[PDB]
Design an enzyme around this catalytic site. Structure first.
Site, PDB file in Angstrom:
ATOM      1  N   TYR A   1       0.903  -1.143   0.000  1.00 26.91           N
ATOM      2  CA  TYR A   1       0.000   0.000   0.000  1.00 26.91           C
ATOM      3  C   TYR A   1       0.945   1.196   0.000  1.00 26.91           C
ATOM      4  CZ  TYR A   1      -3.937  -3.033   1.521  1.00 26.91           C
ATOM      5  OH  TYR A   1      -4.919  -3.998   1.604  1.00 26.91           O
TER       6      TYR A   1
ATOM      7  N   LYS B   1     -12.501  -5.022   3.387  1.00 27.48           N
ATOM      8  CA  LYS B   1     -13.554  -5.503   4.284  1.00 27.48           C
ATOM      9  C   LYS B   1     -14.911  -5.805   3.661  1.00 27.48           C
ATOM     10  CE  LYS B   1     -10.703  -5.635   7.386  1.00 27.48           C
ATOM     11  NZ  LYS B   1     -10.221  -7.017   7.641  1.00 27.48           N
TER      12      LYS B   1
ATOM     13  N   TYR C   1      -6.742  -5.834  10.399  1.00 22.27           N
ATOM     14  CA  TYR C   1      -6.516  -6.279   9.041  1.00 22.27           C
ATOM     15  C   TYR C   1      -6.901  -7.730   8.844  1.00 22.27           C
ATOM     16  CZ  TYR C   1      -4.446  -6.303   4.358  1.00 22.27           C
ATOM     17  OH  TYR C   1      -4.221  -6.457   3.004  1.00 22.27           O
TER      18      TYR C   1
HETATM   19  C1  LIG Z   1     -12.349  -2.177  -6.311  1.00 20.95           C
HETATM   20  C2  LIG Z   1     -13.000  -3.160  -5.329  1.00 20.95           C
HETATM   21  C3  LIG Z   1     -12.174  -3.836  -4.522  1.00 20.95           C
HETATM   22  C4  LIG Z   1     -12.643  -4.590  -3.460  1.00 20.95           C
HETATM   23  N1  LIG Z   1     -11.674  -5.234  -2.814  1.00 20.95           N
HETATM   24  C5  LIG Z   1     -12.123  -5.991  -1.784  1.00 20.95           C
HETATM   25  C6  LIG Z   1     -11.153  -6.913  -1.124  1.00 20.95           C
HETATM   26  O1  LIG Z   1      -9.984  -7.240  -1.496  1.00 20.95           O
HETATM   27  N2  LIG Z   1     -11.711  -7.635  -0.022  1.00 20.95           N
HETATM   28  C7  LIG Z   1     -13.019  -7.536   0.442  1.00 20.95           C
HETATM   29  O2  LIG Z   1     -13.381  -8.007   1.515  1.00 20.95           O
HETATM   30  N3  LIG Z   1     -13.853  -6.704  -0.244  1.00 20.95           N
HETATM   31  C8  LIG Z   1     -13.421  -5.987  -1.298  1.00 20.95           C
HETATM   32  N4  LIG Z   1     -14.399  -5.355  -2.131  1.00 20.95           N
HETATM   33  C9  LIG Z   1     -15.827  -5.409  -1.815  1.00 20.95           C
HETATM   34  C10 LIG Z   1     -16.599  -6.619  -2.388  1.00 20.95           C
HETATM   35  O3  LIG Z   1     -16.387  -6.703  -3.814  1.00 20.95           O
HETATM   36  C11 LIG Z   1     -18.101  -6.468  -2.142  1.00 20.95           C
HETATM   37  O4  LIG Z   1     -18.362  -6.111  -0.787  1.00 20.95           O
HETATM   38  C12 LIG Z   1     -18.882  -7.744  -2.567  1.00 20.95           C
HETATM   39  O5  LIG Z   1     -19.063  -7.781  -4.026  1.00 20.95           O
HETATM   40  C13 LIG Z   1     -20.253  -7.870  -1.894  1.00 20.95           C
HETATM   41  O6  LIG Z   1     -21.053  -8.932  -2.428  1.00 20.95           O
HETATM   42  P1  LIG Z   1     -22.591  -9.001  -2.517  1.00 20.95           P
HETATM   43  O7  LIG Z   1     -22.980 -10.349  -2.922  1.00 20.95           O
HETATM   44  O8  LIG Z   1     -23.195  -8.469  -1.293  1.00 20.95           O
HETATM   45  O9  LIG Z   1     -23.025  -8.020  -3.630  1.00 20.95           O
HETATM   46  P2  LIG Z   1     -22.699  -7.963  -5.212  1.00 20.95           P
HETATM   47  O10 LIG Z   1     -21.401  -8.558  -5.506  1.00 20.95           O
HETATM   48  O11 LIG Z   1     -22.955  -6.579  -5.635  1.00 20.95           O
HETATM   49  O12 LIG Z   1     -23.727  -8.905  -5.918  1.00 20.95           O
HETATM   50  C14 LIG Z   1     -25.062  -8.514  -5.847  1.00 20.95           C
HETATM   51  C15 LIG Z   1     -25.833  -9.235  -6.944  1.00 20.95           C
HETATM   52  O13 LIG Z   1     -27.221  -8.942  -6.885  1.00 20.95           O
HETATM   53  C16 LIG Z   1     -27.705  -8.774  -8.206  1.00 20.95           C
HETATM   54  N5  LIG Z   1     -28.899  -7.927  -8.306  1.00 20.95           N
HETATM   55  C17 LIG Z   1     -28.939  -6.537  -8.215  1.00 20.95           C
HETATM   56  N6  LIG Z   1     -30.156  -6.035  -8.288  1.00 20.95           N
HETATM   57  C18 LIG Z   1     -30.987  -7.107  -8.439  1.00 20.95           C
HETATM   58  C19 LIG Z   1     -32.355  -7.157  -8.564  1.00 20.95           C
HETATM   59  N7  LIG Z   1     -33.069  -6.022  -8.468  1.00 20.95           N
HETATM   60  N8  LIG Z   1     -32.913  -8.386  -8.692  1.00 20.95           N
HETATM   61  C20 LIG Z   1     -32.129  -9.443  -8.680  1.00 20.95           C
HETATM   62  N9  LIG Z   1     -30.801  -9.488  -8.564  1.00 20.95           N
HETATM   63  C21 LIG Z   1     -30.277  -8.279  -8.447  1.00 20.95           C
HETATM   64  C22 LIG Z   1     -26.548  -8.216  -8.905  1.00 20.95           C
HETATM   65  O14 LIG Z   1     -26.669  -8.382 -10.298  1.00 20.95           O
HETATM   66  C23 LIG Z   1     -25.344  -8.901  -8.345  1.00 20.95           C
HETATM   67  O15 LIG Z   1     -25.174 -10.160  -8.992  1.00 20.95           O
HETATM   68  C24 LIG Z   1     -13.994  -4.641  -3.237  1.00 20.95           C
HETATM   69  C25 LIG Z   1     -14.909  -3.960  -4.072  1.00 20.95           C
HETATM   70  C26 LIG Z   1     -14.416  -3.229  -5.113  1.00 20.95           C
HETATM   71  C27 LIG Z   1     -15.416  -2.561  -6.050  1.00 20.95           C
HETATM   72  N1  LIG Z   2      -7.432  -3.424  -0.018  1.00 17.36           N
HETATM   73  C1  LIG Z   2      -7.443  -4.120  -1.147  1.00 17.36           C
HETATM   74  C2  LIG Z   2      -6.441  -5.030  -1.347  1.00 17.36           C
HETATM   75  C3  LIG Z   2      -6.405  -5.755  -2.511  1.00 17.36           C
HETATM   76  C4  LIG Z   2      -7.354  -5.604  -3.505  1.00 17.36           C
HETATM   77  C5  LIG Z   2      -7.315  -6.452  -4.648  1.00 17.36           C
HETATM   78  O1  LIG Z   2      -6.408  -7.286  -4.799  1.00 17.36           O
HETATM   79  O2  LIG Z   2      -8.174  -6.460  -5.523  1.00 17.36           O
HETATM   80  C6  LIG Z   2      -8.356  -4.682  -3.275  1.00 17.36           C
HETATM   81  C7  LIG Z   2      -8.407  -3.953  -2.130  1.00 17.36           C
END
Ligand SMILES: Cc1cc2nc3c(=O)[nH]c(=O)nc-3n(C[C@H](O)[C@H](O)[C@H](O)COP(=O)(O)OP(=O)(O)OC[C@H]3O[C@@H](n4cnc5c(N)ncnc54)[C@H](O)[C@@H]3O)c2cc1C
Ligand SMILES: Nc1ccc(C(=O)O)cc1
Ligand SMILES: Cc1cc2nc3c(=O)[nH]c(=O)nc-3n(C[C@H](O)[C@H](O)[C@H](O)COP(=O)(O)OP(=O)(O)OC[C@H]3O[C@@H](n4cnc5c(N)ncnc54)[C@H](O)[C@@H]3O)c2cc1C
Ligand SMILES: Nc1ccc(C(=O)O)cc1
Lengths: 394, 394
Positions: free
Chosen positions: B201, B297, B385
């Site tokens: 980082y 997270k 972490y």
């Molecule tokens: C850049 C980035 C980096 C991240 N890095 C990390 C990391 O390293 N570690 C970590 O812990 N977290 C990280 N996260 C967070 C993590 O990606 C999310 O918290 C995770 O995707 C949550 O999952 P979810 O199933 O709740 O929601 P989502 O993944 O958003 O899935 C929700 C689903 O519901 C569906 N849906 C939406 N609306 C409807 C509807 N109306 N009807 C039916 N279906 C619907 C969607 O199409 C989607 O498939 C990161 C996120 C990003 C964007």
């Molecule tokens: N804090 C983070 C660390 C790693 C990544 C990732 O690998 O996608 C995203 C967020």
């Protein structure tokens, strides 16, 4: 008139430095704008770090402190209807802090200086500093109408935030860092037994409150107050009612109230200047930095600046190592910034800020819950509270 | 059509919950707006807490993860020309984190669900939730033109930030906490070996940079970028040049670059809703809260919401203890707020903020120096972490 080290300011910084210097054989003269009585009227600090307690011993002015000072092994923080005790001694690996008023420390130093017969000129009016970069700097002042000159090798500016010393450095050589908080502390000193044997810092929806003490029969309380407040608007009764409204019920019930011996409002602010020296002028204490009262670091940082200045001066005079003095600012600033960071953190988690959004209030409460609930969180508070170690120099 | 638990969303939350439920005998149907391929196209997360790794094992979908996942015992933080390694394993008392992409976890879950033959309806359009407070709630959706009805006992909204579930709760019953950051992350996935065996980082004057990975031959890099940026304005070459300018020289020298497989900008934000349920509807994951990516997270909090929802549902169906479901929000929110506090802290010390005064920049640098230099500071980062422990319930 000639001396080795000219000291501007007879507050704790100047007196402590002057005492250490005198005891080692380095002559010094102190110039103070006010009278002994005015200086002795300032209440201020109540909490001392172990490092400051050891420095007082080294200066040989610890008799009264060892007798009357109260050693504290813990402190409480109250928030959201709960009180949490931080065991400083356990969590910091055995260190504690001492409660001994700044007024008392100053009194001890003044008596010590008089007994040794070192020079102190009170009511030294219109002090001016000259030839700061020359090999022979000098100070001019006025005593009862006549302008006198004092020649010296070095000048230590121990004149607080409104002193002349920092103003004597070309502004372009200085880098100023400052934050003004939108609130102040209304403090009240009373001849009443404290509500607790340890301090209680309180975060309450109405604002911050702090329960402190000076001795077994003298208390010091504070409550956060808007900057618009005037002390004449706060009767003793209004203060006690306000204090009680901000404390946990079981604490407010056993509170012994009484008429105030002193009542005043102190604004909160952070201020650091870099570097802390210019030519043969060295800034120490409030003259170089201000920290909000929340962390009880002000007088304690002054002590470390002083311990550092004294040891470097000793090296300069005793060992002819005058070049080490260039390291003064670098050494002090490392400690100053960590103490500023701590005072700032304490201030942000214990006070109520104007126009705070819902998210920030929740984060504030969560900071408390995390740091007070985790063994690692507790230790970061405790080690910072007792005071980080002084650096050794060279 | 009838089931026991209706699940809206086939992202990791919905699939994980559905798998746990299926394995315990609680029938469940998942409704997803998109196609399997669309869902599998989202890169997102790379870092998993030990708690999430154990949940995957409990769901019986850990074969590929145990083979391909990389276990990390440390992480580096670079700032002001220095790199500091936080030994997570040592400082947290033995815990580590696992790097296994979210795309992979989702793929593992989807294959697992298909093999067990549980119901999943993709392209379920216009999902609507009804009679949330009745004893018989139901879901309606459209599949190829015809509106169908699904009857259930409970509904788990696992539909992310833009889902229909949170929108179905009367706004007056919800309390929203939100902070929008004035920047986003531009991420780039490449089939190149990572620059380091652990994450880096970086706080750099130009902005934040993060060096991550997916496997021994696949990397994931991020750089802080203004909200005004458009991805089409960032060629691969511009990205690598920018990344290199923000990393320590010895790290930028050994960086193997390559064409991007995926490039996108994700805005940073904090969002929490209280409570996380209404009647027979329970929100989980991104549907209930968003945390900035900085602390890794998001997916990890979704796992804990899911672990909690599953165990409460089991109690409800297996033991007839339906009343325990009322405790869902209270249990999840305790963990959510501490994780939000950590993600917020990481974000504030690693990124460059617009119009920051001198004092704050110095405090930012000092926060790093303190936390990375103190054994107690290091431990607060490390324990947060790796992930704070899940609560046990009841
Ligand atoms: C850049 C980035 C980096 C991240 N890095 C990390 C990391 O390293 N570690 C970590 O812990 N977290 C990280 N996260 C967070 C993590 O990606 C999310 O918290 C995770 O995707 C949550 O999952 P979810 O199933 O709740 O929601 P989502 O993944 O958003 O899935 C929700 C689903 O519901 C569906 N849906 C939406 N609306 C409807 C509807 N109306 N009807 C039916 N279906 C619907 C969607 O199409 C989607 O498939 C990161 C996120 C990003 C964007
Ligand atoms: N804090 C983070 C660390 C790693 C990544 C990732 O690998 O996608 C995203 C967020
Ligand atoms: C409400 C309050 C609570 C505090 N609580 C604590 C606490 O518990 N613990 C702690 O560590 N710190 C605390 N502090 C901070 C502490 O009081 C200060 O940091 C301390 O007074 C610094 O001492 P000093 O000698 O540098 O400056 P000062 O005490 O300001 O003394 C400077 C002296 O220089 C003199 N002078 C000024 N101008 C001139 C001039 N032009 N010529 C000659 N002489 C001049 C002044 O008259 C004064 O005597 C508190 C402060 C306040 C206000
Ligand atoms: N943090 C502080 C603690 C105590 C006092 C005081 O007793 O005067 C002041 C500040």
């Amino acid at each position: 008139m000639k001396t080795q080290v000219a000291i501007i300011g007879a507050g704790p910084s100047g007196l402590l430095l002057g005492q250490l210097l005198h005891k080692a054989g380095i002559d010094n003269v102190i110039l103070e704008r006010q009278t002994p009585d005015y200086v002795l009227g300032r209440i201020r600090a109540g909490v001392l770090e172990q490092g400051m307690v050891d420095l007082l011993r080294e200066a040989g002015v610890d008799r009264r402190m060892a007798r009357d000072g109260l050693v504290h092994e813990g402190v409480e923080i109250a928030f959201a209807g709960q009180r949490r005790r931080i065991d400083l001694k356990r969590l910091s690996g055995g260190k504690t802090v001492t409660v001994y008023g700044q007024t008392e420390v100053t009194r001890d130093l003044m008596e010590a200086r008089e007994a040794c017969g070192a020079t102190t000129v009170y009511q030294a009016a219109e002090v001016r500093l000259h030839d700061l970069q020359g090999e022979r700097p000098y100070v001019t002042f006025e005593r009862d109408g006549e302008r006198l000159r004092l020649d010296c090798d070095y000048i230590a500016g121990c004149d607080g935030f409104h002193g002349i010393s920092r103003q004597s450095i070309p502004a372009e050589r200085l880098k100023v860092f400052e934050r003004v908080y939108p609130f102040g502390w209304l403090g009240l000193l009373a001849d009443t037994p404290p509500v607790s044997h340890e301090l209680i810092y309180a975060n309450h929806p109405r604002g911050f409150a702090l329960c402190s003490q000076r001795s077994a029969t003298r208390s010091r309380y504070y409550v956060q107050v808007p900057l618009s407040e005037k002390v004449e608007d706060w009767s003793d009764e209004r203060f006690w009612t306000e204090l009680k409204a901000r404390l946990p019920s079981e604490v407010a019930e056993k509170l012994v109230t009484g008429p105030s011996l002193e009542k005043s409002i102190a604004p909160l602010r952070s201020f650091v200047v870099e570097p802390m020296q210019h030519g043969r002028l060295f800034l120490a204490g409030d003259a170089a930095h201000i920290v909000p009262p929340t962390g009880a670091k002000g007088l304690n940082l002054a002590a470390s600046d002083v311990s550092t200045l004294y040891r470097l001066l000793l090296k300069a005079y005793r060992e002819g190592r005058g070049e080490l003095l260039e390291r003064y600012s670098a050494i002090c600033l490392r400690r100053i910034w960590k103490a500023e960071r701590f005072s700032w953190w304490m201030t942000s988690v214990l006070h109520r800020f104007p126009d705070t959004d819902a998210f920030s209030q929740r984060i504030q409460q969560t900071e408390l819950e995390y740091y007070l609930g985790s063994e690692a969180g507790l230790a970061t508070i405790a080690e910072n509270y007792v005071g980080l170690p002084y650096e050794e120099i060279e």
